[PDB]
Amino acid sequence: SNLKISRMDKTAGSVRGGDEVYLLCDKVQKDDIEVRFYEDDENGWQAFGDFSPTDVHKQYAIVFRTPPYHKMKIERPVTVFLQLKRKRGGDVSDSKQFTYYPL
Amino acid sequence: SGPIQLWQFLLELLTDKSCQSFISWTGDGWEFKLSDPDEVARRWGKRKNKPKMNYEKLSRGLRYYYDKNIIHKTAGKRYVYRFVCDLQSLLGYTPEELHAMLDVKP
DNA sequence: GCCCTTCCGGGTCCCC
DNA sequence: CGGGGACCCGGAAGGG
């Protein structure tokens, strides 16, 4: 049923992507789960955490890699959101913060 | 934006100061050098779950980019390759600007 | 189809 | 000189 991010390993990363995040969550199916990063402007940026079905641990955790931001040129730390999302299902989770850094 | 691609992985490395010892910008637009190729291939291998990854094979990844407007070789220069694709749109900066932030001694 | 990964046969260097 | 051993080049097969 409903999707919950219980807690996360970390809530900040480099704008360049690649940061490894341990997300703890309620029951998920390895083959019907996606981690969507987003920004809710008219710009409407989205991206997906990079992981595989084997990185999904006993139905209750995901180990994944952050995607890049849409740009590296920022001089004050930016904040985007993220949610769990079923590929087939539409339904998503309560969306946690994530924060991108320069350099 | 799923499984990261080779060109994308190298770009990630290129923007980390803590990786400059084994991969770095030459200081000429988007030209870059794998100063320690064994290391670079070891990390690419790690990210993609391929223990037996080496530069010989990673290089074949790079050669499939040659007709695809992503990356070219710089003829004659050992381990030197050039991004031909639109990096200024991807990462906000020009090459000169990026080189400044990352202390690139050309 | 895509994007490599794994091979390979062939080419040019340089160095022992 | 003759060989190995690096980089390189792309074709072919195959996986996920």
Author numbering:
A (entry chain A): 226 to 328
B (entry chain B): 332 to 437
Sentences copied from the publication:
ETS1/2, unlike GABPA, only activate −146C>T mutant TERT promoter through cooperation with p52 downstream of non-canonical NF-κB signaling. p52 is a member of the NF-κB family of transcription factors which regulate gene expression in response to a wide array of signaling by binding to consensus κB sites of 5′-GGGRNYYYCC-3′ (R is a purine, Y is a pyrimidine, and N is any nucleotide). The major domains of ETS1 protein include the PNT domain, the acidic transactivation domain, the ETS DNA-binding domain and autoinhibitory module which consists of inhibitory helix 1 (HI1), inhibitory helix 2 (HI2), helix 4 (H4), and helix 5 (H5). p52 consists of the Rel homology domain and the glycine-rich region.
